Each structure stands twice: as C-alpha cells, then as structure tokens.
Amino acid sequence: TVFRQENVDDYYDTGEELGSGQFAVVKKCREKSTGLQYAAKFIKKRRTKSSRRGVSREDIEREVSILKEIQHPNVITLHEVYENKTDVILIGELVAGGELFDFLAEKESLTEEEATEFLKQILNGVYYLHSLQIAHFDLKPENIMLLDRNVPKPRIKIIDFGLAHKIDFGNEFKNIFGTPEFVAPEIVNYEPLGLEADMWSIGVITYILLSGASPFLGDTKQETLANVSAVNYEFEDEYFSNTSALAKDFIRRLLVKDPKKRMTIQDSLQHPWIKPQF
Numbered sequence: 001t002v003f004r005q006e007n008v009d010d011y012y013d014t015g016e017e018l019g020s021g022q023f024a025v026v027k028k029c030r031e032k033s034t035g036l037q038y039a040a041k042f043i044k045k046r047r048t049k050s051s052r053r054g055v056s057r058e059d060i061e062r063e064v065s066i067l068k069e070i071q072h073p074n075v076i077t078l079h080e081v082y083e084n085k086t087d088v089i090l091i092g093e094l095v096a097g098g099e100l101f102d103f104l105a106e107k108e109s110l111t112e113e114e115a116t117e118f119l120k121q122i123l124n125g126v127y128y129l130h131s132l133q134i135a136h137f138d139l140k141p142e143n144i145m146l147l148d149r150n151v152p153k154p155r156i157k158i159i160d161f162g163l164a165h166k167i168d169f170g171n172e173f174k175n176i177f178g179t180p181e182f183v184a185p186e187i188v189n190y191e192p193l194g195l196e197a198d199m200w201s202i203g204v205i206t207y208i209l210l211s212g213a214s215p216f217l218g219d220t221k222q223e224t225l226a227n228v229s230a231v232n233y234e235f236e237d238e239y240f241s242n243t244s245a246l247a248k249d250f251i252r253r254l255l256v257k258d259p260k261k262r263m264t265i266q267d268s269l270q271h272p273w274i275k276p277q278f
C-alpha cells in the first residue's frame with residue numbers, strides 16, 4: 001500500500017522534537033488548513049532489501065494497518081500518513097503531558113491509589129486492543145503518555161505500535177523483541193508469542209509504579225534477560241513493606257512464566273485489587 005507523496009511541509013509546520021526511537025523521531029506539528037496540532041513520527045525506510053538499517057516496508061505497513069483500526073480514549077489515533085524516498089511520516093494524536101516514565105521520575109513516590117488510577121486506564125486500553133486481537137508487544141512507561149500532568153488523576157494514552165501484531169492464530173512466531181526489562185520469558189526464549197506477553201509487561205509496569213524499582217534489572221541486558229527467563233524477582237521490604245497484599249497478589253499473577261497460567265486482560269479487570277536485545 002502507498003501513502004501521500006506530497007511534501008509534508010506543504011501541509012504542516014513542524015516544531016519541537018518530542019522524542020525518538022532507533023529508528024524514528026517524533027516532532028510536534030501543526031496542520032496548515034485546520035490549525036490543529038499533531039505529533040509526527042518520522043520512520044526511516046530501508047535503503048536496500050538486504051539492509052539491516054531502517055524499517056522494512058512490511059513492518060511499516062503492519063503498523064499503519066493496525067493504527068487505522070483503533071479508536072479508544074486510552075490509545076493514540078492516527079491522522080494521516082505521508083512518505084518520501086527516505087521516510088514514512090505517521091501523523092497522529094499529540095499527547096501533551098509527557099511520558100509516564102518522566103512523571104514517575106519527577107516526583108518518584110506513588111500511592112496505591114495513584115498507581116491503580118494509572119493502571120485501570122492502561123488495562124482499559126489493553127482490553128480494547130486485545131479484544132481486537134492486537135498484541136502491543138512494547139508496553140513500558142516510555143509508551144504511556146499523560147494528557148495533562150498537572151491534574152491529580154492524569155488521563156493516559158498508549159502509544160507506539162511499532163512492534164504491534166495481529167494475533168489471529170492464538171500466537172505469532174517471528175522474533176519480535178522489545179526492551180529487556182519489560183519483555184516476557186517467551187520473548188527471551190524465542191517461543192511463539194500471543195496476547196499474554198502484554199500481561200507480563202503490565203505486571204512489570206505495576207511493580208515499578210508501586211516501588212520505583214525495576215523487578216528484573218541487571219547490570220547488563222544479558223543479565224536482565226536471564227533474570228526474566230528465571231522469574232528472578234522479589235518484593236523488597238524496603239519498597240513494599242506497606243504495600244497491600246492484594247497489590248502483591250495482582251503482580252504475582254501476571255509475573256508467571258507459563259503464559260497459559262498468567263492472568264488474561266479480562267482476569268485482570270475482575271481481580272479484587274482492580275474490580276470496584278543485544
């Protein structure tokens with residue numbers, strides 16, 4: 001499939017840089033005809049078929065196809081797609097309040113209620129996606145954006161569908177691999193992947209929200225991945241001594257090696273704590 005090949009600068013002005021991937025840079029922009037503001041993700045194309053730099057057209061088209069399906073308050077919308085010889089440019093919904101990651105850094109101590117307020121929204125967004133058989137496969141605090149950081153209960157949106165796949169056959173097998181601290185054991189072990197991997201990532205995110213510490217993190221990526229595969233984490237009393245047993249129960253039921261035994265998205269919403277590479 002082909003995208004709009006007019007110069008994006010004919011239709012938009014760009015501003016500040018909002019962030020980046022390998023890979024990809026995201027800039028604020030403004031549509032000339034409406035005055036509305038967006039975020040534009042510039043993804044570098046592969047320059048040859050044999051090249052390992054840039055993103056393959058297959059991978060770009062998959063991301064665009066998935067994004068076109070989605071509309072839910074807790075997920076980003078896609079507005080337009082442009083392309084030229086070097087880039088595909090995905091224009092989508094600006095989320096102005098920064099990363100949950102940055103958030104957590106400033107300040108860094110969340111109550112269980114602040115943590116569950118974030119979590120409930122993440123779970124609602126993932127419920128929507130999983131209902132559509134979409135695995136995100138890159139859930140982490142860098143990919144959860146706040147609409148407005150200056151309100152007591154910030155609203156969030158899930159972003160970055162660069163690794164997202166449709167799961168039409170219960171699992172997919174193609175060596176998808178995100179950030180070591182957040183990937184499930186099946187990703188580490190190059191096993192077939194399904195919606196369960198996202199549920200593991202949610203358990204990791206929850207642990208971080210409550211404690212400010214990363215449960216599997218080692219001194220090298222190697223060591224992190226080995227920790228993940230062995231399910232080598234524990235609840236440090238220094239961080240968790242006054243966290244409720246139910247919060248710990250929730251995380252325990254997500255950080256499970258066997259994906260078949262791990263809580264599903266529907267399970268997570270009914271759980272008593274929630275229910276009202278190289």
Ligand SMILES: OC[C@@H]1O[C@@H](n2cnc3c(NCCc4ccccc4)ncnc32)[C@H](O)[C@@H]1O
Nearest residue numbers: 018019020026039041076090092093094095142
């Ligand atoms: O991805 C690196 C990042 O750069 C920033 N970022 C990425 N997407 C952002 C956005 N909106 C998405 C609009 C979009 C929708 C659909 C396709 C492409 C982009 N709003 C604000 N900051 C964003 C964050 O700091 C991230 O950690």
